Amino acid sequence: RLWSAKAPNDFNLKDFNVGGYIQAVLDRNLAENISRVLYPNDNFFEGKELRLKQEYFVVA
Amino acid sequence: RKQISVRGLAGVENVTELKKNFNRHLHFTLVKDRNVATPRDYYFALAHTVRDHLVGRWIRTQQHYYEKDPKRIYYLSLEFYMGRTLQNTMVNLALENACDEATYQLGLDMEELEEIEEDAGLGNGGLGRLAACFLDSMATLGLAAYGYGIRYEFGIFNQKICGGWQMEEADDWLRYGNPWEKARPEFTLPVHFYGRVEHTSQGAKWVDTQVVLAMPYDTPVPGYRNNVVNTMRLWSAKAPNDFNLKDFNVGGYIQAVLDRNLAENISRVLYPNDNFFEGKELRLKQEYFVVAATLQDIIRRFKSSKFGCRDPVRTNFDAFPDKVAIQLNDTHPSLAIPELMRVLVDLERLDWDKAWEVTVKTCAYTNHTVIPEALERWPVHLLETLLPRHLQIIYEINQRFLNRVAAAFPGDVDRLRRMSLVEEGAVKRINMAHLCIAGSHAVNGVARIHSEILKKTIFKDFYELEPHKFQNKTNGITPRRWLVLCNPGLAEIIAERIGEEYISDLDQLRKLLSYVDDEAFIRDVAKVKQENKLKFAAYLEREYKVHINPNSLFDVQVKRIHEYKRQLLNCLHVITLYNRIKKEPNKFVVPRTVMIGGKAAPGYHMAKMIIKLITAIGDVVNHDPVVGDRLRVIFLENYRVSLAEKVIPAADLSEQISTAGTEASGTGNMKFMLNGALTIGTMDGANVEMAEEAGEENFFIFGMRVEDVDRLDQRGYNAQEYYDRIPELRQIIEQLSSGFFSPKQPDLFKDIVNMLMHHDRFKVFADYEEYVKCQERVSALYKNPREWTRMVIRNIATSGKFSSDRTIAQYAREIWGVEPSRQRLPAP
Amino acid sequence: QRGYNAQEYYDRIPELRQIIEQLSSGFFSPKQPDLFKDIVNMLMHHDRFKVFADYEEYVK
Ligand SMILES: *Cc1c(COP(=O)(O)O)cnc(C)c1O
């Protein structure tokens, strides 16, 4: 059983944050890309906040 | 190789094999079991066990259209209001009773499972309902048609009422997969946005564009027991997914996130017309997208259904009008006309005047406005950035068209500034309506008084310069969805007298006229209307709640909540009946259940103040102890195709009250008629033809007619001058603004009292006496059940002019130039 | 309290008749005649601020 990330697609009115603003065009994207790219260890270029986001994703 | 064959699969139409084919899918397709399954599971499972039977014939039809290479008719539209597919697919293929018996011996309930399907989140109202009606007749008339449109991931919002106020939830009707579609990745296509026009010596080119991928999704559409099942190719945008380096551009900024969200939400949302908030780049972005991934799939088809062979002129488009017809439902495909011209002149290379007769012979436009401002108009600056080659084209079309125009009316110059494609002025714009007519051969309106008012005012100077174009095809309804599956009890007795024949050509229903006086027929029509009403009382408590009294006159108005459709008139007479019942209590009122339904439109403030006026009226009248069941006002929630399949069969009177001369036709109109209800209406839209088929004497017409709407305008309507005559109007207005209907916010409905009183763009108050007059005539005759039912019999035996099979045959024959057959065609 | 009907003055005053006239006819704009149709329909029909009512006593 494998997990793929999906962002809540509520973005044009949920929580009533929007209309006014989409910084959140990025929640759906650095989220959709927690599962796009593999990121293999003992290397990589800099202990990226994306990998800590993939591993606690797989776990939760 | 030849043993790879459809021939073999599926055995007998046996509950027997159907129970068995239902167990495979539950386990092998769903990978579910008995113990872990949901009703949603068993629906998906049944909906795959219909589907095997469904797709085998779609294989066979389309391959039968390869070999017999017919002309193809592409019904092109931004909105397919498709509704629900399990029962209509079971009844268009004969399965209902085998599936019914199957699931029943399998321990389950079908009417139950059927209810777990959710309306294909894919259209918004009129324009699209019609598409999905035209789509089913287009099948059933043997026609070679294709529906082409945008697959909307989340349709057009949901209506939830809270606080009395409308609230809009999102519909992610794609949330558990939609069984009916077969996602087609293999046939994706680039649509090119933005870019530059560089003129090579051999031609011009549209260089340096943004590309968006147009992936196809394919849904079958079966006809009524004839075996053609046609295609509905629907498109979803997908940005190119190379996002870290590709173009040797990034490692720097990612702005690039935005194509994968501004291409991505080209198919993520309906933007429904004659409104919206601002003629955004996104809607022009979407018109071109459904159009461009389609003229492309069109031509591609054209070159390959045995067509290197049906040449005989360098695969020429000489035989393209022969073998293709493109119908432009409203000015929403407006660009397939110049996208046709870019694709023939540049990419192939036909000369600019041989690529033209091909275009203008290959297209037709269906019009649906009557008040002109409403017509489409994109600012040219927009068109320049976004579709630059196309604005190159619409301009030379304009240069030629205005020169044909003077090749005909010399000296007139002032006509040229009216028949151009450009509206100079405030900010320069390209009036898509002219483009459509110019680029076409046939220009049909959708009702006789409508197709005439086009002809004579709106599109007048075109009428003059070319008569042959302008057609009509009044609007129509399909008897299979709107009689055989929504009202099988009314369906049943019409067949119990005159056999099923009618289903397939609705003029046989005129035979029903003769049983007007067979006393048994009459008790049967009302046995049925009592049956349908008492399922609705029931749904109206079980799944949402009130205390509907079965025996009341079911007053229903299901409209888009706009100001010109008048539910305010309708609210004023309920506040009026509420006052008589409260002034003198012991008097006989025929009790009514008034049910208004329809979605508002976000950002329409007035439309939202009305939905609240109605629910507020609802807490007073439905709670006040004097009034009993004598009245209830019910606001109907999240009105949509399956709800209407529920309400319309239980309606006794339906409120067609739009200001005379505002509507091209009305299709709900026809559903209520075929379904046993008196109509109460202004003379307008499609009322006129339904009055002339049924006879005025059976229709509850009233109010201002076009003539005297015009005339009130010349003297100038002053709502206070009617308010001044009529006491009860003052009684009810003064309750609105006294805060009678909103106890804790007094000045609340002030929004509506002022608008009514001084700024009424639509003459609510004018038609107030006459409206409550016809209504008393309605209440009066419902007191006489052999005669209400005797009227209903006249009104419904008269439905034939209103099946979409008629409308479509006149399309098929007079425009799409093909004769619509109705031959069974074979299958395994 | 009386409902300002604008077309009313329209009909006494021959001048005013004659100047709403010229505007929408297309007098004051022959390349775009229709143009001040807006203003016409504002004045003859939806005028909140009562232009035609203060005309004559102003002209005068
Ligand atoms: C048929 C139908 C329409 C048509 O409404 P009109 O009264 O013709 O404008 C729209 N919505 C639903 C749900 C329908 O069933």
Side-chain angles (χ1 to χ4, degrees), chain A residues 1-40 42-43 45-60, chain B residues 1-272 274-275 277-828, chain C:
Chain A
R1 171 121 93 192
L2 281 59
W3 307 105
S4 60
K6 267 133 185 139
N9 215 101
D10 289 89
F11 309 117
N12 95 105
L13 255 195
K14 255 236 202 315
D15 182 272
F16 287 73
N17 44 13
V18 279
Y21 256 109
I22 358 166
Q23 292 49 40
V25 152
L26 297 125
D27 174 333
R28 74 168 305 257
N29 277 293
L30 308 119
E32 240 165 27
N33 87 189
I34 309 178
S35 45
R36 297 189 170 306
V37 35
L38 234 160
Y39 247 14
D42 263 39
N43 188 175
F45 230 146
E46 61 185 335
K48 226 212 271 198
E49 195 239 21
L50 197 54
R51 237 188 96 82
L52 187 49
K53 273 151 82 153
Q54 302 198 293
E55 308 171 9
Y56 164 83
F57 178 83
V58 66
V59 144
Chain B
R1 275 67 242 216
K2 286 215 172 197
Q3 179 150 76
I4 257 179
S5 184
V6 224
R7 90 188 297 263
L9 309 319
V12 192
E13 323 266 45
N14 247 292
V15 160
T16 288
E17 276 294 302
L18 275 173
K19 283 189 288 206
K20 216 174 86 316
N21 255 58
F22 158 112
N23 298 110
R24 300 192 74 80
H25 293 111
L26 186 70
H27 305 60
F28 302 174
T29 304
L30 265 43
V31 190
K32 285 296 159 92
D33 132 7
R34 210 234 314 304
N35 306 115
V36 147
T38 9
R40 192 151 187 75
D41 278 306
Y42 297 118
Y43 157 64
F44 275 97
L46 168 73
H48 288 96
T49 306
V50 170
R51 193 179 152 282
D52 295 353
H53 308 100
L54 205 183
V55 279
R57 304 148 208 254
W58 182 43
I59 282 156
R60 294 281 200 220
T61 309
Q62 302 293 275
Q63 59 192 188
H64 148 100
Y65 286 113
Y66 184 139
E67 280 40 57
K68 237 64 208 64
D69 178 45
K71 106 181 282 153
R72 282 146 138 146
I73 166 271
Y74 292 100
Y75 202 78
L76 234 172
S77 165
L78 270 33
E79 195 212 282
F80 273 47
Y81 210 172
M82 212 79 156
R84 278 173 177 168
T85 281
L86 197 243
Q87 192 153 86
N88 180 226
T89 288
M90 302 208 270
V91 324
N92 271 28
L93 238 70
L95 293 317
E96 189 122 36
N97 315 315
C99 294
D100 184 72
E101 183 73 41
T103 28
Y104 154 66
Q105 277 147 90
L106 271 173
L108 321 161
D109 184 313
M110 187 167 69
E111 191 186 348
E112 193 177 277
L113 300 160
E114 297 179 322
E115 271 298 300
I116 318 213
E117 178 167 28
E118 281 193 20
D119 286 61
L122 199 33
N124 202 4
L127 195 87
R129 178 82 279 289
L130 199 55
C133 253
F134 283 30
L135 284 199
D136 186 273
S137 299
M138 287 198 229
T140 286
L141 294 184
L143 290 195
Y146 284 102
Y148 265 83
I150 289 175
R151 171 184 183 258
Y152 285 104
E153 221 136 299
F154 311 105
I156 200 337
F157 77 102
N158 284 148
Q159 170 152 303
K160 288 301 292 125
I161 288 281
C162 279
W165 298 108
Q166 165 175 293
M167 217 32 104
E168 5 296 97
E169 269 179 24
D171 183 26
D172 63 321
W173 74 289
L174 272 163
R175 209 184 311 134
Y176 291 90
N178 139 37
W180 299 117
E181 64 194 343
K182 181 63 188 59
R184 295 299 210 198
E186 318 99 62
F187 302 79
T188 282
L189 309 174
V191 164
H192 276 239
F193 287 102
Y194 305 84
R196 172 174 67 79
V197 174
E198 197 173 70
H199 263 263
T200 162
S201 183
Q202 168 60 143
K205 269 172 76 204
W206 184 8
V207 307
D208 298 358
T209 63
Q210 233 267 241
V211 139
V212 182
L213 292 189
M215 154 93 151
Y217 264 100
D218 277 338
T219 306
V221 292
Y224 187 74
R225 288 110 143 169
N226 84 106
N227 290 348
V228 299
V229 187
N230 268 25
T231 276
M232 189 185 37
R233 177 72 119 202
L234 221 78
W235 310 108
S236 63
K238 277 183 148 69
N241 197 122
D242 325 25
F243 291 117
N244 65 140
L245 330 147
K246 220 277 196 285
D247 176 55
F248 270 69
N249 50 354
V250 303
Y253 277 93
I254 19 181
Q255 293 63 355
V257 179
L258 282 137
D259 171 1
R260 90 158 313 283
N261 256 277
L262 293 173
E264 222 137 69
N265 92 28
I266 290 191
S267 47
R268 312 225 76 145
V269 55
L270 261 152
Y271 251 16
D274 263 37
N275 188 175
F277 231 150
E278 63 188 330
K280 226 203 288 184
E281 225 215 22
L282 185 76
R283 188 162 189 57
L284 172 64
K285 208 70 71 92
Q286 304 184 320
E287 288 175 29
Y288 187 79
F289 187 76
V290 86
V291 150
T294 6
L295 258 54
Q296 281 201 46
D297 204 7
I298 280 181
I299 280 179
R300 171 169 78 146
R301 182 163 290 131
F302 176 43
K303 305 187 163 193
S304 298
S305 263
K306 265 163 97 86
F307 243 100
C309 352
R310 225 223 80 148
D311 193 88
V313 53
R314 93 212 132 277
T315 51
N316 209 2
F317 299 89
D318 279 302
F320 195 43
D322 281 28
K323 314 256 297 216
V324 155
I326 268 167
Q327 192 69 210
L328 270 65
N329 185 38
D330 226 284
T331 50
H332 300 128
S334 41
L335 294 174
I337 297 175
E339 176 49 18
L340 206 42
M341 286 306 253
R342 181 191 59 100
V343 199
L344 290 178
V345 162
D346 307 350
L347 296 305
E348 301 290 308
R349 213 83 77 243
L350 305 203
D351 89 276
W352 200 91
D353 299 40
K354 177 51 187 166
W356 196 212
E357 144 260 53
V358 174
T359 289
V360 66
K361 274 167 159 267
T362 289
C363 281
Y365 156 43
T366 302
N367 182 301
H368 332 35
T369 208
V370 55
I371 322 298
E373 65 294 17
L375 254 55
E376 216 119 27
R377 289 140 170 109
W378 283 134
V380 294
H381 59 106
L382 223 80
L383 254 45
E384 190 159 58
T385 306
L386 206 13
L387 300 332
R389 173 73 235 244
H390 291 277
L391 200 265
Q392 302 228 311
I393 293 176
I394 299 170
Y395 277 0
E396 171 57 7
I397 285 181
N398 193 23
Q399 189 278 282
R400 292 169 178 257
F401 185 69
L402 302 201
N403 253 111
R404 160 188 154 63
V405 164
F409 299 78
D412 212 351
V413 161
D414 182 31
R415 199 204 203 87
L416 305 162
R417 59 133 284 261
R418 295 178 311 265
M419 289 175 83
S420 166
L421 299 258
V422 183
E423 287 184 2
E424 289 278 352
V427 77
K428 179 181 191 63
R429 287 155 201 273
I430 274 195
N431 172 283
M432 296 324 254
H434 294 163
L435 210 163
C436 268
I437 323 175
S440 258
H441 74 47
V443 159
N444 55 298
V446 93
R448 196 207 305 121
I449 45 123
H450 176 75
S451 272
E452 285 326 290
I453 52 212
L454 298 185
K455 239 174 275 174
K456 304 185 192 65
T457 54
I458 290 312
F459 291 176
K460 157 211 149 312
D461 317 60
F462 297 65
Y463 186 37
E464 280 142 70
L465 201 245
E466 278 140 329
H468 43 270
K469 195 164 295 181
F470 291 77
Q471 206 146 3
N472 168 282
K473 298 289 178 247
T474 294
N475 244 175
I477 263 64
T478 188
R480 279 68 56 185
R481 190 180 222 91
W482 302 118
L483 210 186
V484 196
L485 36 127
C486 75
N487 222 328
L490 202 151
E492 185 175 54
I493 59 92
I494 296 197
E496 270 202 341
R497 313 307 139 106
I498 73 167
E500 174 280 81
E501 243 304 321
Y502 70 90
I503 290 186
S504 191
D505 54 322
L506 234 43
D507 285 326
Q508 290 192 37
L509 230 65
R510 214 155 192 123
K511 286 181 178 164
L512 222 46
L513 195 36
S514 30
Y515 301 62
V516 163
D517 277 299
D518 158 26
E519 268 276 281
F521 195 51
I522 300 192
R523 56 204 56 146
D524 297 310
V525 170
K527 148 93 313 303
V528 179
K529 189 65 56 160
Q530 201 175 333
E531 245 80 73
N532 290 175
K533 261 149 65 99
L534 190 68
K535 290 178 162 86
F536 208 73
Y539 167 92
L540 227 50
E541 248 134 63
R542 271 171 37 110
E543 285 76 45
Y544 310 135
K545 77 88 182 296
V546 220
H547 177 137
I548 283 30
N549 153 337
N551 293 88
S552 56
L553 180 160
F554 276 25
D555 203 347
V556 299
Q557 157 159 237
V558 275
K559 294 263 70 171
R560 166 172 63 166
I561 296 205
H562 186 300
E563 281 153 289
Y564 75 86
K565 312 272 233 202
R566 237 106 126 273
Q567 31 251 314
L568 284 164
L569 203 32
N570 196 212
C571 294
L572 286 178
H573 158 311
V574 199
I575 301 160
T576 291
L577 252 47
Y578 171 62
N579 283 341
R580 283 112 94 123
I581 299 171
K582 281 294 281 283
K583 163 171 148 282
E584 312 158 50
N586 321 287
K587 196 181 166 295
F588 172 80
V589 41
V590 168
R592 302 183 62 152
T593 292
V594 168
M595 290 178 254
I596 305 186
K599 311 237 190 64
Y604 198 0
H605 162 241
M606 261 309 304
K608 284 177 162 274
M609 226 60 236
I610 291 176
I611 291 172
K612 181 52 208 230
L613 210 191
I614 307 168
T615 46
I617 294 179
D619 312 287
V620 141
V621 319
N622 298 350
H623 284 109
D624 168 41
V626 174
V627 216
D629 329 285
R630 301 159 74 211
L631 272 204
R632 310 294 167 153
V633 167
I634 301 260
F635 183 76
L636 257 174
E637 224 195 8
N638 188 36
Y639 180 59
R640 63 185 127 104
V641 184
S642 68
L643 227 202
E645 294 180 24
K646 262 79 130 117
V647 68
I648 292 162
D652 299 276
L653 195 241
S654 66
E655 290 278 352
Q656 294 305 338
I657 62 179
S658 190
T659 285
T662 53
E663 297 207 323
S665 123
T667 296
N669 270 56
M670 317 187 183
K671 310 180 199 178
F672 278 123
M673 186 156 208
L674 208 194
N675 270 310
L678 302 193
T679 314
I680 180 183
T682 54
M683 192 57 151
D684 197 34
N687 292 353
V688 160
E689 287 155 71
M690 284 172 307
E692 25 161 273
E693 280 280 18
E696 296 218 6
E697 328 71 70
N698 306 285
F699 244 88
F700 286 91
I701 290 137
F702 72 111
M704 220 132 55
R705 258 54 79 97
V706 206
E707 195 313 293
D708 26 298
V709 118
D710 277 43
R711 298 274 294 324
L712 189 62
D713 277 328
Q714 270 167 77
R715 208 217 63 173
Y717 172 80
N718 181 167
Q720 175 156 4
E721 91 160 336
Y722 284 69
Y723 158 78
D724 299 64
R725 311 147 60 237
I726 320 170
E728 315 97 287
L729 188 27
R730 293 186 266 288
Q731 161 89 103
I732 61 192
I733 282 267
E734 228 84 43
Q735 287 181 105
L736 298 173
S737 37
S738 46
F740 189 31
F741 280 124
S742 44
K744 275 57 178 288
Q745 298 95 285
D747 350 71
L748 179 65
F749 288 109
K750 262 204 52 61
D751 280 293
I752 296 136
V753 178
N754 282 86
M755 120 66 163
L756 242 21
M757 287 265 53
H758 311 324
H759 300 93
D760 187 4
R761 328 209 299 101
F762 295 112
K763 302 136 168 79
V764 171
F765 283 37
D767 275 339
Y768 178 80
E769 301 157 65
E770 279 256 87
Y771 177 54
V772 188
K773 234 86 254 71
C774 205
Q775 279 270 291
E776 298 182 23
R777 294 208 305 269
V778 150
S779 205
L781 162 101
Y782 189 45
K783 296 195 307 313
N784 201 336
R786 225 196 75 121
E787 271 323 304
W788 202 99
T789 308
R790 282 247 305 176
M791 299 244 309
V792 169
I793 286 160
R794 223 120 54 226
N795 299 117
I796 301 166
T798 259
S799 327
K801 145 71 121 53
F802 294 141
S803 159
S804 25
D805 302 347
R806 169 205 52 105
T807 313
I808 281 310
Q810 288 170 243
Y811 272 105
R813 313 172 173 304
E814 304 168 62
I815 287 195
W816 305 338
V818 237
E819 231 61 324
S821 153
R822 205 153 153 255
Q823 273 171 267
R824 218 228 167 190
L825 185 172
Chain C
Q1 293 185 45
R2 217 239 60 183
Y4 160 59
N5 198 160
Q7 178 143 347
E8 165 157 327
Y9 306 87
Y10 182 59
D11 285 289
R12 317 211 269 99
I13 304 72
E15 300 152 304
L16 185 68
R17 228 191 289 336
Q18 120 150 119
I19 59 178
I20 292 310
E21 249 55 299
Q22 304 168 100
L23 305 206
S24 48
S25 79
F27 179 62
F28 278 122
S29 35
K31 245 61 193 281
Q32 282 162 264
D34 9 286
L35 221 83
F36 300 105
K37 222 197 84 60
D38 266 344
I39 329 186
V40 164
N41 261 100
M42 124 69 195
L43 284 326
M44 293 268 31
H45 278 332
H46 306 111
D47 172 3
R48 308 237 290 102
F49 285 109
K50 300 113 152 68
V51 169
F52 297 168
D54 261 337
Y55 185 46
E56 303 151 75
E57 224 277 276
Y58 173 64
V59 199
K60 181 168 291 111

